[PDB]
Amino acid sequence: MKYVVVSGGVISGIGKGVLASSTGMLLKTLGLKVTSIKIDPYMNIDAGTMSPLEHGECFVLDDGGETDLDLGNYERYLGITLSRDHNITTGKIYSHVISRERRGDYLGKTVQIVPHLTNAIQDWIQRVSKIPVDDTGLEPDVCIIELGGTVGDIESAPFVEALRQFQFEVGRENFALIHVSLVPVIHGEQKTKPTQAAIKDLRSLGLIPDMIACRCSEELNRSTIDKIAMFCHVGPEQVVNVHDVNSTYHVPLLLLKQHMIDYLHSRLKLGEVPLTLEDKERGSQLLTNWENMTKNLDDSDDVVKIALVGKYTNLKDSYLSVTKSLEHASMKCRRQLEILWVEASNLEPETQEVDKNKFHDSWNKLSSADGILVPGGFGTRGIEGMILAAKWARESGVPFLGVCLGLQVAAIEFARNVIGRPNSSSTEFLDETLLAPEDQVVITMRLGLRPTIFQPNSEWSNIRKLYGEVNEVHERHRHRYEINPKIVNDMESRGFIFVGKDETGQRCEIFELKGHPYYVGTQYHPEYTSKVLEPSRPFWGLVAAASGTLGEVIKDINL
Amino acid sequence: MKYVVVSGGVISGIGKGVLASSTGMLLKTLGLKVTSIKIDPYMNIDAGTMSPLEHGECFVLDDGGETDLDLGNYERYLGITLSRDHNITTGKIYSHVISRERRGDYLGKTVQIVPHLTNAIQDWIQRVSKIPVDDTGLEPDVCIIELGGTVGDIESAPFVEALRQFQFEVGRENFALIHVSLVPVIHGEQKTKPTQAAIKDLRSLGLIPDMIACRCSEELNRSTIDKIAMFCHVGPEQVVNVHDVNSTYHVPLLLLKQHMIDYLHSRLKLGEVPLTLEDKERGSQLLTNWENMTKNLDDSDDVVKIALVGKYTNLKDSYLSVTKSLEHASMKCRRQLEILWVEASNLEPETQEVDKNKFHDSWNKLSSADGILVPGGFGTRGIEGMILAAKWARESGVPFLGVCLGLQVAAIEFARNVIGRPNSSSTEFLDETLLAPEDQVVITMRLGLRPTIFQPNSEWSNIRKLYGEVNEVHERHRHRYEINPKIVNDMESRGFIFVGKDETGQRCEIFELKGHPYYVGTQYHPEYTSKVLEPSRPFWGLVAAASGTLGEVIKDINL
Amino acid sequence: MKYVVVSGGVISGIGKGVLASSTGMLLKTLGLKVTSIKIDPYMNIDAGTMSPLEHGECFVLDDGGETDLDLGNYERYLGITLSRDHNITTGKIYSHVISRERRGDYLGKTVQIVPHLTNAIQDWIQRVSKIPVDDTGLEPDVCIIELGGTVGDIESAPFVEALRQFQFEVGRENFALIHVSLVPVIHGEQKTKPTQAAIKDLRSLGLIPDMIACRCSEELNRSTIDKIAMFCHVGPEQVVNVHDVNSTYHVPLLLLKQHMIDYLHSRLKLGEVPLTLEDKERGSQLLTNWENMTKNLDDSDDVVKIALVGKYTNLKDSYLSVTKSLEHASMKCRRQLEILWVEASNLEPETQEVDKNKFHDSWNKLSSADGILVPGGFGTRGIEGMILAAKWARESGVPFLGVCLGLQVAAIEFARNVIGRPNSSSTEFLDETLLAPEDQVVITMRLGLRPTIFQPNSEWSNIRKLYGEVNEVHERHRHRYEINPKIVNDMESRGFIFVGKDETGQRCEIFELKGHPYYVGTQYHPEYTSKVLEPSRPFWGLVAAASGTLGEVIKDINL
Ligand SMILES: Nc1ncnc2c1ncn2[C@@H]1O[C@H](COP(=O)(O)OP(=O)(O)OP(=O)(O)O)[C@@H](O)[C@H]1O
Ligand SMILES: Nc1ncnc2c1ncn2[C@@H]1O[C@H](COP(=O)(O)OP(=O)(O)OP(=O)(O)O)[C@@H](O)[C@H]1O
Ligand SMILES: Nc1ncnc2c1ncn2[C@@H]1O[C@H](COP(=O)(O)OP(=O)(O)OP(=O)(O)O)[C@@H](O)[C@H]1O
Ligand SMILES: O=c1ccn([C@@H]2O[C@H](COP(=O)(O)OP(=O)(O)OP(=O)(O)O)[C@@H](O)[C@H]2O)c(=O)[nH]1
Ligand SMILES: O=c1ccn([C@@H]2O[C@H](COP(=O)(O)OP(=O)(O)OP(=O)(O)O)[C@@H](O)[C@H]2O)c(=O)[nH]1
Ligand SMILES: O=c1ccn([C@@H]2O[C@H](COP(=O)(O)OP(=O)(O)OP(=O)(O)O)[C@@H](O)[C@H]2O)c(=O)[nH]1
Ligand SMILES: [Mg+2]
Ligand SMILES: [Mg+2]
Ligand SMILES: [Mg+2]
Ligand SMILES: [Mg+2]
Ligand SMILES: [Mg+2]
Ligand SMILES: [Mg+2]
């Protein structure tokens, strides 16, 4: 196994995940089988009970792991499936050796951070990097390890000791370190000093970078590259310049043209990995696919506006998988996506009494939609704001997708305005009395990859026709609440057909409304299964409907 | 609450525990109520499943906590009872916040080492320092915190952050730091440089020593004290000189004469603690008691030799509580104790085929006994070696105490040589066939303070007469095995009377043999209850019998 | 003496000098006498033989010290005169103790960085902070120490040890530390982590900030201020927010409104400094003056364009004193200054063969002048480019100031085009043959405050009338070359009158050309004497002439 560690910098939120994902994607263009491990040095065992103001969205895995959105970056760039073992945390690793000490496995010795916890980190990396994550089912060739946070944090201390020990457990030809760092620009001076401090903090912890990646608001000057290669003990070929590109799909193509792949190929002896003519063929095909879709994104600049209505829409990484899933769909349609970031609370009439401007800008943005998305949501504050947008899309014919909370507000709105239940509601939203017209109810979490089966007469529906001839869709869940199973056969009478369900028939998982060109929702999160070259079908349907091109996209799928 | 942190140095095994125990004992001479917390920065939740080649004996608490022998130092010097909460470990504190994160208590935030783990350490210290540990049942005035290991270890990093934060959560008048450091002597130069490195490592972690304690093989030169007070930013009154004294009972009297108590009194504003005339009276009485017993130890130099037969007897901290319990008994009798450190395996005839010298030196030492002790033991290797010494003491009339494994080998030996069971044995020692004559059997551990009740006709026995008129003794247990309850009434026929038992009658806990001046054993560990001014009664009995003074000691107790 | 140390950050080039200068200016508004010391931790004994691509212009002192442009910031904000002792360097301080060791002054002891070099730094700060630097001639009350570079550099290591020792040599009420740090903004997140690293590097070196100053491209969020006050152990009143203001004259007024002065007043006990009613009167007058000139700068937005022709004009701190001197003049005239940054080489016809665009943009900018400045210069490359602009200003009547190299190119141009010497030249520019018509010649440097005397019949000249009735001007020099003394009486025949000279008559130091409304030059650097409330007279003349307001400004001076 070869290891690329992507690490550090003076800040988090810089590009370690995009650069790791890009590096792994580029090694996959040589036909290498690439896996990835995220290390999040935090006490949380998982991202499941975090709130998205810190580290953005939760990402759900096939096994129902709730994880850092970096695993989502790896899944979509590398085209791989990860387990909850591919995320290591301080919480996970301390819990592991503390269980192993209580079990007596350390044979009466003092259990210590070195050797025992750093051994356990190295054992975890070696175990998990051998797990097959491609659909070929073969063991990986390269593992990208991304060390989250900053090097020289108190939290990352056990992991940097584990990684400098690992660098000698595996040979030098098997381990390379990339350090990502900020080059700030101050009065048009590009400042090298934060990167010099960061490389001295690496050396202080016993690590030496094989690459520097510099993140900057402009291209590095050759003065700046040479001063980095003086005060950090590296050659100028070992500095890469990653300059705030207009889209993340272009970042691999910077790293490619700057000869990073030629450096890593030599530095890790990658020509000595056995690769078949089929592997190099798949690798070269991926390069041509990626260059095609990046050219298409760059060239095909004609707009589509999708209004995204939800909480926290000022923090755009709170919806990273939604944003990326919408981009995959829009790039497949060769249209320039704009996301209209509508704070759902601003649409509520109670905002208009506080401020005219936010209410009118948010309703004008919602009115400016070619299509509407109500994504999954983190809490109750804004449910009426989302029901208002669910209504306006139904009323005005604008293409609509309801994902998770979106399906729940779509069924609530339709019950209120089309079934004729003028007070029907959500058990999540209110429990002040034991209401009889409860549309959304509980049946501690439903997580991971589950089968949704299509209902027998569903073939009229555009959502099934976007999946094609198939009877099952396999998709990822994250919900404790769902629709009340006694109400659904009354709701189907007005045309809100539950197109797909659990194999039991007791859980409702896809709907399409008959009386509308595209008014759909899913109880699964379709974002988490989206890939750069093959979008998630509900999101491809939404953007194709919003473009007016739905029939042409449904025709391409069923061919 | 006032806090004295005792910390660090270039080595462990130096004196932090003796100096902490001495400092706390001295603050108790002002009548202050003194508690203590040990921080062991290791992954072990407790010392229960460790082996004594690292950090010496396990110490058992009243609650059945299995802990570092430093809690035993605090219990005997301060005269206090500790809970398993008075030892903090890396294993305990990570397990605590990881449970609290899984329980959702951190309200959706990222759980991190700062603030969340260092808050949890500060909360634990504040909670536990308020627990009553004196028999007065009042809240403590001063807490001695002893930080185990070395400052600038990766393991101690979260605790030094917690302690430098704690120094500002409590006011400066409430927190003082003592740093203990090695002054090596090299060609008669006293070297200050290891202490200069240690004080710069403290400053680096944001802590400043209020005291330096220097451990040295000779008294510090005034050149050495002045060079410490130059290169460490302290006054010469802030350096104490702790010079390898002939016994640890003299260490408080160094720290007292060197004005450490006058420094701490001013530095922590201790005259502003409310103290009653009864508190200052108890405090002054303790000082006079301690000066009396130290003078008695220094003056009363006439020898008694107790042979201690067990595993690991080359590592004398493997028996610290036994050693200290024997010293308390010997000082009460005003006799100079020598411990004859007999490796039990060397007494076995199979040693004589390897080496004559170890077999003959160990049997000559055992023959040189005024009395014999078989302490509790860590494993099977040497059980025959301990049965040989149990025999020779019974045969030759030499006073014998069997503690734990000692009682078990004493009953095994008596079954083999006095009941006439020529093959009877221990379920711990052998299980190669389903033996019928099993004397030692299992009934996952029995731990903590339990009542032993004396049997009704037991009053002839010298062991009961050493406890006095009382019907119960309350003592601490650490055994999974004990005596077979069907055999005991046959064993009593030859005079091996089980003087005391559990309240059930089903568990046997004290015996005395009739036909011998002192041949006794306990299923409890009597060491763990011993105090400097009042020895453990089985050990007072052993040393008094070995001195020939048993009647005079039994007369002093029953007066 | 009170001490404010201004320090550190993840970068240099951030604001330590502007914030130090602003802080000292604000303490002067309380009537305190404020001095300043710069520490430049570099091997250069002085800035005299540096080149301005690193650390901008050289600044010349009254004693002829050649120093960091920070001493120029202190001189103009605080209104004080500094000596070469007010700049400490690694070169200066090592040279000092190495001389003192060679002289035997350390009495046979090992001379070491601690104590001997850090003592010498503390002795230098104490000596130099007592030197009178105001015109009142009294000893200072507060010394601002600005530590140049980054804290945790290898170069700054001896100075941070000296400063943490100094913090205890002087009492806490006498020493306060301000740390200046970068808060970068990345996708609209304000990132606290670089400042957390910087405050842990301070604590690591044994220093604790009394203030954080955060430099950011926008106002700090209260989330950001609170997260700084969590992870750096400070109160939220101890964080100041210094947000990229449109001019440096507004920076004191941020620090004032954010209660920094109220914090420092309490933290340094400044009400306990004895101050007279005259001191507080001068202090309050300075505040009203500063608020008046900042309002005038903000309000009076009507443009004047001064074209500045020289080397390195892309690096605007290469001319900081010129830029600031031009602003003082422009603010006195209540006009909005634009500086047209003309690279003198681009005006040369040889540029037009390489690139049309730079030649035409630079000549169009020069043509766009309301007035022209040829400042002092660092070398020969561009002398013809400066002679071209000297010509075009003379030819087209545009107001011209020649400072240093400017006077030399003005005399060269006039010799070439008005005396009729078609080949006359500079000994600095060419020495390929022993030319007879040398206008600029050598008489190793002429530095510091020197008297220029006005010639007796000079009173017609506008430059004398801008100084007023006076016979002497005292001004600062930095030249090895000057005008040939045999040529001047021929050059005066065509109206290029040398209005002022050295007291010898042998050195020529001010000229004015008769046939032009303002075509002047100085052999001294008039920038170095400029003050915020009272501009340098040659620069006040230039901007007033360029504004068309010269008569009104000359009338205000002579009133
Ligand atoms: N060069 C770039 N140009 C544009 N966007 C970029 C670039 N590099 C990264 N990004 C975007 O920046 C976001 C933040 O970066 P990333 O998540 O990779 O940062 P980080 O340092 O890894 O930490 P964190 O997980 O805390 O955000 C990414 O999710 C990606 O969308
Ligand atoms: N000045 C002294 N003279 C004699 N014996 C001493 C002295 N100081 C300490 N000791 C003895 O040294 C032993 C080892 O010291 P102590 O346990 O206090 O060390 P440490 O640094 O605390 O660490 P550890 O718990 O790992 O042994 C003590 O148990 C005590 O019996
Ligand atoms: N808040 C601000 N807004 C605008 N300009 C500023 C601000 N703070 C500083 N400046 C300008 O920035 C320049 C660079 O800052 P300054 O010289 O004070 O930086 P530094 O960290 O001190 O180091 P160096 O001396 O190396 O430049 C100053 O000369 C000043 O003109
Ligand atoms: O105020 C100052 C700034 C700088 N210096 C001296 O100049 C040296 C130059 O180092 P700088 O800190 O100026 O930066 P750098 O050259 O590493 O380049 P950037 O990352 O900023 O682009 C410093 O390391 C120190 O010796 C000072 O002495 N004082
Ligand atoms: O080989 C040597 C030894 C010492 N030295 C120089 O002498 C200085 C004296 O420092 P030392 O390391 O000699 O020790 P010290 O004075 O701190 O005293 P002890 O702790 O050893 O008792 C050192 O810090 C260094 O400057 C050398 O240059 N080389
Ligand atoms: O990739 C990552 C980023 C962050 N983290 C975890 O989140 C913690 C939050 O710390 P961050 O490094 O995210 O920053 P911060 O909260 O100090 O705030 P800014 O300065 O960036 O504004 C980190 O210290 C670490 O525990 C990770 O585990 N991995
Ligand atoms: Mg990441
Ligand atoms: Mg953060
Ligand atoms: Mg100890
Ligand atoms: Mg050890
Ligand atoms: Mg400066
Ligand atoms: Mg620089």
Task: Find chain A residues with C-beta within 8 A of C192's C-beta.
Answer: none
Q: Do C233 and B203 touch (CB under 8 A)?
A: no
- Please choose, from the candidates C61, C131, C25, the residue with its C-alpha nearest in 3D space to the C-alpha of residue C533: C25
Expressed in angstroms and rounded, the spacing between residue B15 Cα and the centre of ligand 2 is 4
> Token digits for C170?
């002087």
The secondary structure of residue C432, as a DSSP letter, is S
CB contact B94 to C (< 8 Å): no
For the domain covering A295-558, report its CATH number: 3.40.50.880
What whole-number distance in Å separates Cα of residue A369 and Cα of residue A309?
11
Side by side, which strands form the sheet with C336-343? C336-343, C303-310, C371-374, C400-403, C519-522, C508-513, C496-501, C446-454, C472-479
Query: Vertex C194, ends C189 and C197: CA angle to 5°?
Result: 140
Question: Helix crossing, B118-129 with B90-102: angle to 10°?
Answer: 110
The yes-or-no answer on residue B96 being catalytic is: no
Confirm if A10 and A198 have CB atoms less than 8 A apart.
Answer: yes
The residue written with tokens 């026709």 in the block is A465
The phi and psi torsions of A4 (rounded to 5 degrees) equal -110, 115
Distances (CA, A) of A31 to A288, A328, C125: 13, 23, 65
What whole-number distance in Å separates Cα of residue A386 and Cα of residue A346?
10
Distances (CA, A) of A285 to A33, A254, A281, A291, A404: 14, 19, 6, 10, 35
What whole-number distance in Å separates Cα of residue B471 and Cα of residue C486?
125
Question: Helix crossing, C550-558 with C537-546: angle to 10°?
Answer: 140
- Residue owning the nearest CA to atom 16 of ligand 3: C15
Ligand 6 atom closest to the CA of A12, numbered from 1:
12
Confirm if A325 and A539 have CB atoms less than 8 A apart.
Answer: yes
Smallest CA–CA separation between C204 and chain B, in Å? 4
How many C-beta atoms lie closer than 10 Å to residue C391's C-beta? 17
Q: What is the largest CA-CA distance in chain B?
A: 74
Chain centroid, CA B97 distance in Å? 30
**Residues contacting C400, CB < 8 A, separation 6+:** C371, C372, C373, C374, C390, C393, C394, C410, C516, C518, C519, C520, C521, C542
Confirm if B310 and B377 have CB atoms less than 8 A apart.
Answer: yes
What whole-number distance in Å separates Cα of residue C385 and Cα of residue C387?
6
Query: What string of H, E and C letters represents the secondary structure of A497-555?
Result: EEEEECCCCCCEEEEEECCCCCEEEECCEHHHHCECCECCHHHHHHHHHHCCCHHHHHH
Candidates C11, C189, C197; nearest CB to A184: C11
Sign of CA dihedral B231, B234, B237, B243: negative
CA-derived radius of gyration, chain A? 25
What whole-number distance in Å separates Cα of residue B74 and Cα of residue B83?
12
The ligand whose atoms approach the alpha carbon of C214 most closely is 3
The ligand whose atoms approach the alpha carbon of C19 most closely is 3
**Residues contacting B40, CB < 8 A, separation 6+:** B68, B87, B88, B89, B90, B148, B149
Which technique was the structure solved with, according to the deposited record?
A: cryo-EM
What whole-number distance in Å separates Cα of residue B252 and Cα of residue B242?
10
Task: Find chain B residues with C-beta within 8 A of A101's C-beta.
Answer: 43-45, 49, 91
Task: Find chain C residues with C-beta within 8 A of A318's C-beta.
Answer: none
Smallest CA–CA separation between A395 and chain C, in Å? 36
What subunits touch chain B, counting only 3 or more CB pairs under 8 A? Answer: A, C
What whole-number distance in Å separates Cα of residue C184 and Cα of residue C193?
9
- Annotated catalytic residue: which of B146, B404, B477, B516? B404
What whole-number distance in Å separates Cα of residue A12 and Cα of residue B275?
53
Fold equal for A2-290 and A295-558: yes
What whole-number distance in Å separates Cα of residue B358 and Cα of residue B342?
10
The phi and psi torsions of B93 (rounded to 5 degrees) equal -75, -35
> Token digits for A184?
């700030």
What whole-number distance in Å separates Cα of residue A474 and Cα of residue A458?
17
The secondary structure of residue B322, as a DSSP letter, is H
- Residue owning the nearest CA to atom 11 of ligand 1: A15
Query: Vertex B47, ends B46 and B53: CA angle to 5°?
Result: 155
- Please choose, from the candidates A139, A101, A133, the residue with its C-alpha nearest in 3D space to the C-alpha of residue A117: A101
**Residues contacting C552, CB < 8 A, separation 6+:** C544
- Residue owning the nearest CA to atom 24 of ligand 4: C149
Smallest CA–CA separation between B6 and chain A, in Å? 21
Catalytic residues of A: 404, 525, 527
What whole-number distance in Å separates Cα of residue A507 and Cα of residue A479?
12
Residue type for A30, please?
Answer: L
- Residue owning the nearest CA to atom 28 of ligand 4: C40
Confirm if C468 and C557 have CB atoms less than 8 A apart.
Answer: yes
Candidates C13, C152, C191; nearest CB to A191: C13
Ligand 5 within 6 A of B221 CB?
A: no
What whole-number distance in Å separates Cα of residue B266 and Cα of residue A556?
86
**Residues contacting A553, CB < 8 A, separation 6+:** A332, A333, A466, A540, A541, A544
**CATH class of the region A2-290:** alpha beta
In chain A, the residue whose alpha carbon lies closest to the alpha carbon of C55 is: A189
Query: What string of H, E and C letters represents the secondary structure of B474-540?
Result: EEEEEECEEECCCCHHHHHHHCEEEEEECCCCCCEEEEEECCCCCEEEECCEHHHHCECCECCHHHH
- Please choose, from the candidates B407, B511, B373, the residue with its C-alpha nearest in 3D space to the C-alpha of residue B452: B511
Which residues does a gap of C–N over 2.5 Å follow in chain B? Answer: 443
User: In what helix (H) or strand (E) does residue B127 lie, and over which residues does it extend?
Assistant: helix B118-129
Expressed in angstroms and rounded, the spacing between residue B13 Cα and the centre of ligand 10 is 8
Pairing of strands A58-60, A142-147: unpaired
How many C-beta atoms lie closer than 10 Å to residue C222's C-beta? 9
What whole-number distance in Å separates Cα of residue C438 and Cα of residue C424?
6
DSSP string across C486-554: TTHHHHGGGTEEEEEE-TTSSSEEEEEETTSSSEEEESSBGGGG-BTTB--HHHHHHHHHHTT-HHHHH
Residue spans per domain, chain B: 2-290, 295-558
Q: Where are the alpha helices (DSSP H) in B335-374?
A: 349-354, 356-367
Question: Helix crossing, C405-414 with C383-396: angle to 10°?
Answer: 60
In chain B, the residue whose alpha carbon lies closest to the alpha carbon of A103 is: B49
Beta-carbon-side half-sphere exposure of residue C24 (alpha carbons within 13 Å)? 34
The secondary structure of residue A415, as a DSSP letter, is I
For chains A and C, count residue pairs whose Cβ atoms are closer than 8 Å.
46
Map residue C59 onto helix, strand or coil: strand
> Token digits for A351?
């905002």
In chain B, the residue whose alpha carbon lies closest to the alpha carbon of A42 is: B112
What whole-number distance in Å separates Cα of residue A399 and Cα of residue A333?
15
- Annotated catalytic residue: which of C143, C214, C232, C404? C404
Given its phi and psi angles, is residue B335 left (phi above 0), alpha (psi -120 to 50 degrees) or beta? beta
User: In what helix (H) or strand (E) does residue A321 lie, and over which residues does it extend?
Assistant: helix A320-332
